[model samples]
Target chain A: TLMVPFKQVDVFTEKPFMGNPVAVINFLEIDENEVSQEELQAIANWTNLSETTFLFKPSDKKYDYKLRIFTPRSELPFAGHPTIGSCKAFLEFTKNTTATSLVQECKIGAVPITINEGLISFKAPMADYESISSEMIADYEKAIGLKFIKPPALLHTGPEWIVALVEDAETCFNANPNFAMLAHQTKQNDHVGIILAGPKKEAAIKNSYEMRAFAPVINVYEDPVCGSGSVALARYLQEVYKFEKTTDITISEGGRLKRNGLMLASIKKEADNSTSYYIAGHATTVIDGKIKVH
Target chain B: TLMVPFKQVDVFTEKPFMGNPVAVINFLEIDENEVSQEELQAIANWTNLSETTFLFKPSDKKYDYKLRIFTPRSELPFAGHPTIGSCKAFLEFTKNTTATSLVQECKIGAVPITINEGLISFKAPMADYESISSEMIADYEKAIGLKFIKPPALLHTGPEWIVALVEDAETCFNANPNFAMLAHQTKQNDHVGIILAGPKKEAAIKNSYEMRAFAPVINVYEDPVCGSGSVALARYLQEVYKFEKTTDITISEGGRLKRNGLMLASIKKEADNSTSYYIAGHATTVIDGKIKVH
Candidate 1:
């Protein structure tokens, strides 16, 4: 058995040392029986990356194998930049500019990845957004100190999420949610998720929206930049709210928070009333090292 | 003068990366004839250490030098761990291990230090504590949170505090004070500080009561471990309930959250109604580093 080290690499170019760093380990052309998923997972936990993954060849050779993300807390189904950044890094490292394609299997399902210049974009499964009710508003207000103007909702795009459209962009931008309450409230819900999106615009982007996500029950207070929640929110607004435009939509995130990320998403509706989303952006890698399994 | 690059250091062992960290730097010896108090303070402002200090000796030898502290947000008269940890680090760094030590004067006053068995304790000036009237209870309660309980008058020990005596420690421990109300109410009440201390023993504490403090107006939010509030609470109990003879009483702070700290308080009463409070505790450095001047 061969032992390979993995590095928690954060991608995106906002700042050198300040981006989504994920643990990445690539296993290609090696005996499948030699490495186990548990070993990769253990290495990821030790790195304590926001996300982790193992890249290897599947029995089917149609596409390249991708990463599996894990937090010190637990494993993740699908993640945004970690998947995108890790895939791009793997292509560069393996010198595979020919095929230049990657497909990943997150807890959610198989996701496809594509890269252009330095930006990476992914097209996951189509999402279905569900509306939130009024009864849950009290719990949300208590938990996050905000009142949703558009009420709260639960969206099942790629991952299931509870959506809260806040009174104004200000409250949405400045979310000082009581994490303890959020941790408890999000858990009681079925799919147990939350997406706080506001029509908040920044001077940089004229006519777009801003959003934040919290999966506290899963121990994610504020995900630096949440691709699943962002896509889910965009799809919900496009499908349920009937919001449609190809213009740039800026999702202002990571305000008054650490490892905050600004993810720009493009939304388009398919013919069958299903919305297709492309959560695309740049990630910067600052720290790189290897984790050896004992 | 020597300057060094700094990294933000989070203290208190909070999730490794979740706690607060400070940027630290050292300054050269100040000449009494050259540098004025205003100049020293200005340098402190420029250093911007949440709190910054300069331990400088007079070129001539008349009296011991001082360590001054200034916060980037603002200059503090007296703050908790900054006072203890900064001085302890300075003492060890300079290799000055005298049994009895004196800290130079600041905006507050001269603070004395005593060291034994590697445990360092600072004796701040004896600040008097007085029992306040009951009329301010409603305003105080309304200011902190909707579920807040009423209690007796406001008091001050040091660091300019407002003390509330709740019915039980549980009520106090569970009360999540509304910071906005507290800020608004405090502004109307001559900037009297706010602290909700109850007599319930925290799960991690024995023979000790817990307290939750909200003073954002002064730039403090649920201080993980509050020394001033502990002193004020100890004096209030002794003056109102007359428990000065009690051997040991601990004030468990950050009860609403989960920071475990004990303030060992001792009280003294004069023949007159005037009472003085002495509160002491061992502060852990948690982190240490120096900031660059550039």
Candidate 2:
């Protein structure tokens, strides 16, 4: 029997149990040969989360740490919430809060992270957008059982998602896509999932809009809070939704399940004046314990 | 911040991650008012299991302990594996393994539990059987995408389940139900869930049949290891399948998801000359930790 340290962090919220939960296993000092890939998959399957991550010593010398992410179904090259949740778990486990910025290495390469107070922000890659044909959008509307206010588009933010827009937040909050049909359409079109977003108010507050991620293709019905989907949404907000490039908006997610997960993110200019998307949130450690694998 | 002890136990299998998982919170010494129902529900939603349990002191003097069960969406009057899982968690926490027999008090009243070696068995209430008409069974077949070897029936094992029969384990393991229409039909017909079971071999080994519980009415898609549904299966094995009255069979469950959950159960006569059903399984604690609530 081998005992491993782990932490369950509730992402995108300060309060525990009110947001998406990700189990982060600490394998910083454990032998890689001791925990096989089969064990990692089994642990993720047992947790049954949208994503689980294992934190290890950095593969890159300059990076702070590295993460390997897994869903209940399979290993993911890159995932959003797990990255965010694992960062906080990693920071808390090491008790290193003095650093203002750090780099996390994963399958997608180095993601620069900034720490301010207790909130954590990660630099998200800008999405390359493409418009969907009207015929396909109509079929999508019928498949999802919801009419779109605007034509849906494809945005590649780590994974490609069909970005669908509706009139109001009520529609976005109440939207439940037929996952079977959505998965079929998504796989056929080489998309990762469906990201539905709509304006919450006639006027944009800090809490401007809500977005829900339905990734039946990856065997996730609805992600409680999506970091990658939020980045795609930030791209859509500026490209067609007419939001300013300097917009500061909070994305509401997992409202249907009373999760109340809030991601404070924005689309702004980087140091080089290039348009960049940033996703940030607060995380609380809900479970701090040890997992014994036999 | 309030820190509390909790255990994540994998039920129906000795090996970790192979069985169904249940989260058990130790509230035996805590004040009842300290933790609200909302907190319990939030915790259950966070864990995202088929069911979670909070173990407390017994309200009845005759019972060893009490359990309050909750699904992700809501509370349950009685649940099977949670009871079994929580008992081991309680025993492990208290470091008392000398007891051979004990009673568990729950919303279902007093349940007698027998502990032998390292396995635990709970006394299951016998279900009252009812036959479903062929017309409804046809609709069920289309809803489940599987053909039955025998006529389907309705059985009450705490929650009502429409028990469907099939030919062998291959068909039973590969079933994927149309949940949209199944939920509609199940709620319209006033059943809690659909329990599908079938013979595994031409000759019954110790391993007899497989069972899958799809509880759309209760918001569970497919229960990995179902306690109540297996009791209904035991009834069907004798009432129609012509298994001998004194039968000991191991029930395979959650095969579609590669879970390979097994329930060791039997049906035998009690000292009062009346028949009763018993469901038993082994459990291993995968997580031992502290949950901090704020």
Candidate 3:
């Protein structure tokens, strides 16, 4: 049996029109051996969104089974919102209790899920630390037109990023990268990205982090809220400086520059070198239909 | 005193409405003594063309004038079409037909220029070779979805670029840059660019090399016949092996990818580390108009 678990769902925002969109499907009675990974990937590619996901188990099963993710251009090994949003949709569809849930299987490996008050979240892949070169940093600063409040680092959750920790929110807000120069600079690093982060200093609040990531040379200039990017930064702070991952610290991203959305993240150190980073958010579906592939 | 010399009577087509468009404004009349660089830059920004030129004549007549270039964003030390397009425009407007049109004054000192049969071409600038890590090459290759014919070399004219000699012309034809990845990679280099090139085995096989430039990470992805990037590639090649300075290199750019008008470039070597190169082609005016500028 084949049924659309989510008739229409956009993964990156609370509303469908405000962020990057994606579609999801659920399998009913199809035999496991009938559809190959390559064939499923091809089908997802035919759909043509940034990504498409498939749910493995029947809709009413107590704890369902697995989920697979794919992009029209290529299939990603792992992604941020799909893990979080899909889990939320799964719980709602199955009438699961509003408590912490665990997904036994996923693209990046098994990760735990938690749903409380209708807000669902999942821990993503562990962030790995990479080395940074000074020569590249100087050029990066010049490319982005700002000096980091502190030194920048190369951080990675699943994808690698060049992380810049800023001194103030003002410096963070007034940031722009010279796309040409930035492209020139990132080619020197092992994996390239500029993730700028600063501590928020409002009147009442003092020590929460806020950030923005720009990867224009590859086409995403400013992502509203990059869950994986934030997770990487949070893990770096925890491992290097002994900071708490899941405290009352809010990291706000994607500040209405072009798109508007928020990815609320909370990190927990699982071990000396590992972190359990979770992001909770919702996406509203705007478009649901088929296009004639003429 | 304020005549906008070098104004394009038309654009976007070599043969009118058959290609993409651009403009080059050589500010020969804007008195440098009377105006500030900021004011000139603002005016250039207001012009809103792909790139704009500002030439300031000093007391010395050895070179025509000092050149300053700007895109909508900021000032650039050197650029491709702007330098070639505006300089040729200068020679045509002033009726100065010297074989070598010397550019003596820019932020980066003097560079020589040469013209041929109204079609301007240039020898590349002095090539400065830098080692490129294997991983960096892989990233560029993967981002553009092309296999490398020759390993990418990090080379510079005034600026550096990663030159990837791709497998064939067809691969070059269908490269959709992973803009985010490309932009991120540039941060590791000197903020230069990534040039993807292939030999012209099929289309108007007149040139030894054909290339495309990506800089959307720097906000410009598909530059129309970039002289800077081409010059960088030539210089990089020359650095590894000796090549003639005063040689005509048919550069097949802006093919079906950009509609029309392949460029013909001439390279000249001078004393010290500088090389003079010019790229020239005919322009067919599409439309002439005035837009409100404050």
Candidate 4:
């Protein structure tokens, strides 16, 4: 039996239990061969989280660390909250508060992240965006058992999600999609999940949008606070609503799940004027301990 | 920040991640008022287990310790695996291995438990046994979308559950109840959950009964391994089929969830001719260390 440091961090919310929980196993110095993929899968399954992550020393100096993410069922190439939560875990474990920026390498690729105090942001990966068919949107509406304010669009940050706009935040907060029907539609359409977002107020405040995500295709009924979904919404707002290039928005999610999670988003303008969208949040380490795994 | 000892124990299986996981918090020596009910509820919600338990020193002299149990949604008067899991945690924390029997005080009352090494059994509370209505059974079959070998029976150990008998182990293992329908039916029937069990072979081996539990009423889709459900099934078999008086059965459950959990059931006959049914299982502490909870 080997004793490894473990932390369960509540990401995207400062409050202890209000956000999504991701278990972070810091295996930085442990032998990679000691923990098999089967063992990792078993640990993830036991935790029963949407995602669990393992951290190890980077093989390449270009990155600070490497991550292996797993869901209850299978391993994921890239996941949103786990990345954010893992970053927080790494900082806390190493007691490094001076670092302003870092690069994390996972199966997807090198992900650049900016850190400011408690808030950490990850740049959204380049993805393909396209307009979905109205007929397909209608099918989704029927399957979801809710009418959308506008036809849904397709955005693939890491995984594809059909983004829909609702009339108001109340509808978004109260929406309950029949998981069976949603699962069927998502599977048929080859989408990762369905994202529903609506304006919370007549005028946008710091807290502007209320959103809910249902992804039975990926075996998640409602993601508490989805980083990927927030990034997709940012892209949608920029492209369709002509939102400002320098974007600052706060999105409330997981209210229906009693999480009441808040995620911050910002679009940064690079030196060359190329814009990059980053999702940011605060994470608290709820459980810090050592787990013996054989 | 308070550094509290925490353990996530896998109940009913010797192997880690093979059975139901219960989060156990040892707050025995801590100030009782330091942790509020809201804090406990929040922690329980964060853990996202079927049940999380907090242990405290007994106020009353009759029991060695007092227990408070909570689910992600609400607190429970009494829960099965939590009781077993908590006992294991208490013993492990106190380093007491020689105790043959002990009493646990909870909201329900004092619960008598017999400990034989890894196998810890809690005496089942006396429950009201009655036959369910045929019309209700019909509705359940329709709701469950499965045929039953016989009419379902109702058992109320603490919360009520309708025990439905399937034809064989394979059918029991393969059973997938429509969760939507089952949730509605369980709510309408005012039952905590539904239990399905069947005979594994003509001659009972180490694994005699295969079972599955679904409790949408309590907001659990499928309990990985249910202790109360197994007790109810044991009583049903003893009463309906007139099984042997002194019985030792190994009940397999949560196979559908890939847990492959095994629970031990025995009908103990005291010296004074009084009879008691005990459900026992092995629990391994998978995660052990201090957790900082503020």
> Each predicted complex: what DockQ?
0.03, 0.56, 0.02, 0.46
lDDT of 3 at A39: 54
Error of 2 at A137 (Å): 6.4
Q: How many angstroms is residue B80 displaced in model 4 relative to the true structure, after the best TM-score fit?
A: 1.1
Q: Where is model 4 more than 4 Å wrong at Cα? A: A126-128, A132-152, A159-208, A214-222, A255-257, A270-274, B31-35, B126-128, B132-152, B157-194, B198-207, B214-222, B269-275
Instruction: Please give the TM-score that candidate 1 achieves against the real structure.
Output: 0.49
Which candidate number maximizes DockQ? 2
Residues A189-269, model 2: lDDT tens digits: 888888898887866475488889999876667877788888888887767756544777678888776688888768786
Q: Write the per-residue lDDT of candidate 4 for residues A106-161, one digit (tens) a residue.
A: 98889988788888888777544689988889888887778887768998888788
Q: Interface-residue RMSD per candidate?
A: 11.6, 2.0, 16.3, 2.2
Off by over 4 Å in 2: A133-153, A158-223, A241-246, A271-273, B135-149, B159-207, B210-222, B241-245
lDDT of 1 by residue, B1-294 (tens): 233322222222223222223323334432444546554454443322345555555233432445455664345667544555555555555667674654544556566655554444554454456545555666676665533343455565545567776767777777777775776777777654677776764355544676776776554556655666666677666656666454345666653443455566656554674554555555433223332222
Candidate 3's displacement at residue B282, Å, is 41
Candidate 3 whole-model C-alpha lDDT, 0 to 1: 0.59
Q: Is candidate 1 or candidate 4 better by lDDT?
A: 4
**lDDT of each candidate versus the true structure:** 0.58, 0.83, 0.59, 0.83
lDDT of 1 by residue, A85-106 (tens): 7776576557676543467655
lDDT of 2 by residue, B54-97 (tens): 98888868988888899888988887789889988988878887
lDDT tens readout by residue for model 3, B1-294: 123433332222245322333444444555677766665565454334566666667447777777777865688776656656566556655667665646546665666665555554433445566768898888887778777877788866555678787766667766777866777878665555787777667655444667777765456656545666666666555554456555545655555332444555555666764565555555432222121111
**Which DockQ value does candidate 1 get?**
0.03
Instruction: Quote the lDDT for B33 in model 3.
Output: 75
